[PDB]
């Protein structure tokens, strides 16, 4: 019972760590895309 509950807790903690890593990867990718769109949106639109 301890082994299964500890395995479940460790799997949940691994899922939490994976969710944190996925959030970090998604946020870095979205930040890179936001930087590219921020560089391209104001390339010529600001003057207009």
């Amino acid at each position: 019972l301890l082994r299964d509950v500890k395995s479940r807790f460790e799997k949940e903690k691994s899922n939490q760590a994976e969710a944190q890593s996925n959030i970090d990867q998604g946020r870095k990718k979205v930040d890179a895309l936001n930087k590219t769109i921020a560089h391209l949106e104001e390339e010529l639109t600001k003057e207009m």
């Binding site: 019972l1 509950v5 807790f9 903690k13 959030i23 979205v30 391209l40």
Partner: protein, 48 residues
């Protein structure tokens, strides 16, 4: 098109963040319930 891609990616990131917060509460309660099981296992091992 890039704003729409960023918006759906941000929505996915927000869903992942909400899942992270709820899963963190769930793991916290699971650990709190699991600790008495570990204590009972230790007491049973000592008695055995």
């Amino acid at each position: 098109s890039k704003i729409n891609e960023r918006k759906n990616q941000e929505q996915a990131i927000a869903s992942y963040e909400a899942a992270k917060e709820e899963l963190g509460l769930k793991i916290e309660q699971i650990a709190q319930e699991a600790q008495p099981i570990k204590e009972q296992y230790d007491s049973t091992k000592l008695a055995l």
